[PDB]
Scaffold this active site. Structure first.
Site, PDB file in Angstrom:
ATOM      1  N   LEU A   1       0.814  -1.209   0.000  1.00 55.78           N
ATOM      2  CA  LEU A   1       0.000   0.000   0.000  1.00 55.78           C
ATOM      3  C   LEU A   1       0.850   1.262   0.000  1.00 55.78           C
ATOM      4  CD1 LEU A   1      -2.792  -1.056   2.575  1.00 55.78           C
ATOM      5  CD2 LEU A   1      -2.790  -1.196   0.065  1.00 55.78           C
TER       6      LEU A   1
ATOM      7  N   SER B   1       4.938   3.105   1.676  1.00 53.94           N
ATOM      8  CA  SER B   1       6.121   3.051   2.529  1.00 53.94           C
ATOM      9  C   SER B   1       6.625   4.463   2.794  1.00 53.94           C
ATOM     10  CB  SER B   1       7.227   2.203   1.887  1.00 53.94           C
ATOM     11  N   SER B   2       6.796   0.598   4.974  1.00 56.67           N
ATOM     12  CA  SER B   2       6.369  -0.577   4.208  1.00 56.67           C
ATOM     13  C   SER B   2       5.099  -1.203   4.782  1.00 56.67           C
ATOM     14  CB  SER B   2       7.486  -1.625   4.157  1.00 56.67           C
ATOM     15  OG  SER B   2       8.689  -1.050   3.686  1.00 56.67           O
TER      16      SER B   2
ATOM     17  N   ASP C   1      -7.220   7.924   1.505  1.00 58.12           N
ATOM     18  CA  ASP C   1      -6.730   8.824   2.535  1.00 58.12           C
ATOM     19  C   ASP C   1      -7.108  10.265   2.185  1.00 58.12           C
ATOM     20  OD1 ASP C   1      -3.214   8.739   1.475  1.00 58.12           O
ATOM     21  OD2 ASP C   1      -4.670  10.317   1.085  1.00 58.12           O
TER      22      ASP C   1
ATOM     23  N   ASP D   1       1.358  14.017  14.690  1.00 56.08           N
ATOM     24  CA  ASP D   1       1.499  14.115  13.237  1.00 56.08           C
ATOM     25  C   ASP D   1       0.126  14.143  12.566  1.00 56.08           C
ATOM     26  OD1 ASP D   1       3.420  12.344  10.619  1.00 56.08           O
ATOM     27  OD2 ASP D   1       2.985  14.485  10.868  1.00 56.08           O
TER      28      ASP D   1
HETATM   29  O1  LIG Z   1      -2.131   2.732   3.447  1.00 55.88           O
HETATM   30  C1  LIG Z   1      -1.593   2.980   4.551  1.00 55.88           C
HETATM   31  O2  LIG Z   1      -0.560   3.675   4.717  1.00 55.88           O
HETATM   32  C2  LIG Z   1      -2.238   2.402   5.810  1.00 55.88           C
HETATM   33  S1  LIG Z   1      -1.440   2.581   7.340  1.00 55.88           S
HETATM   34  C3  LIG Z   1      -2.695   1.768   8.186  1.00 55.88           C
HETATM   35  C4  LIG Z   1      -3.662   1.389   7.327  1.00 55.88           C
HETATM   36 BR1  LIG Z   1      -5.215   0.515   7.907  1.00 55.88          BR
HETATM   37  C5  LIG Z   1      -3.427   1.732   5.989  1.00 55.88           C
HETATM   38 BR2  LIG Z   1      -4.671   1.313   4.628  1.00 55.88          BR
END
Ligand SMILES: O=C(O)c1scc(Br)c1Br
Lengths: 8, 269
Positions: free
Chosen positions: B12, B14-15, B92, B131
């Site tokens: 997804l 970065s790790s 996000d 943060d």
């Molecule tokens: O993509 C990311 O950085 C993260 S960190 C915790 C999660 Br749950 C996800 Br989907």
């Protein structure tokens, strides 16, 4: 101007 | 049993890897952290030396809230592995604002309110995130719920001065820029002002140190007078002049918030 991520 | 209990999928970022718990097909995120790169270490309720991130996540894990839930963790020779609950579908908040541009105030209100509740929850649990930013906020697009992530720069909450900081500089307060000192709550409120501006204007207000300490907030988008006032109050240069969390949530701009499901149905579906 440009939108950007910023590291931690 | 770590590789036997989770099916590991794609990276997804970065790790951090997408994954699924074999026990029940629960979507998870699998976060790997190298021991050599860990700044602050803590001890669990057992005396086991673990990354502070693990300590902070266990303290906020209790119950349901707008904070990412740590499901499990493992220690490896050179790393720790963190198992987090993963919303799906998810985006996000940084990518969301990039794609949508400045958010309608109704939507920014709902989002900002949920971040406030999540950060209050952290502080009630003894945890300072350090943060807060759009990058560290996930949106559950079907439920309309926000989740705060990445406690890797956090600390135990205390009332005395902090003199270390490893978060995002453009969300850090001027007292950190000028003096390398801050207090936890008032620094959090500063970052929340940066975040609210980000939401209603489509990008953060300051990129350079001089802007951060300069005390001037220019609005590049049409933003209501009430919202501008809340932002400028959160971005007061003197920490003691900033609002408490209660004063933010009682602010006139913060009234009549949408419920999460209403938010999803009106703005996300
Ligand atoms: O993509 C990311 O950085 C993260 S960190 C915790 C999660 Br749950 C996800 Br989907």
């Amino acid at each position: 101007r440009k939108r950007r991520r910023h590291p931690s | 049993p770590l590789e036997s209990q989770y099916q590991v999928g794609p990276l997804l970022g970065s790790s951090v890897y997408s994954g699924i718990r074999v026990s029940d097909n629960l979507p998870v995120a699998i976060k790997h952290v190298e021991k050599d790169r860990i700044s602050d270490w803590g001890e669990l309720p057992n005396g086991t030396r673990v990354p502070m991130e693990v300590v902070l996540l266990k303290k906020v894990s209790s119950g349901f809230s707008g904070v990412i839930r740590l499901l499990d963790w493992f220690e490896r020779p050179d790393s720790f592995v963190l198992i987090l609950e993963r919303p799906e579908p998810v985006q996000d908040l940084f990518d969301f604002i990039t794609e949508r541009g400045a958010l309608q105030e109704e939507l920014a209100r709902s989002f900002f309110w949920q971040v406030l509740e999540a950060v209050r929850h952290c502080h009630n649990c003894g945890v300072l995130h350090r943060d807060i930013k759009d990058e560290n906020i996930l949106i559950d697009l079907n439920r309309g719920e926000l989740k705060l992530i990445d406690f890797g720069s956090g600390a135990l909450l205390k009332d005395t001065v902090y003199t270390d900081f490893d978060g995002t500089r453009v969300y850090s307060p001027p007292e950190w820029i000028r003096y390398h000192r801050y207090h936890g709550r008032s620094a959090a409120v500063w970052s929340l002002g940066i975040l609210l501006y980000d939401m209603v204007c489509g990008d953060i207000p300051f990129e350079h140190d001089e802007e951060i300490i300069g005390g001037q907030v220019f609005f590049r988008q049409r933003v209501s007078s009430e919202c501008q006032h809340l932002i400028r109050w959160c971005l007061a240069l003197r920490p003691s002049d900033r609002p408490t969390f209660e004063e933010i949530q009682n602010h006139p701009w913060m009234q009549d918030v949408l419920l999460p499901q209403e938010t999803a149905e009106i703005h996300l579906h």
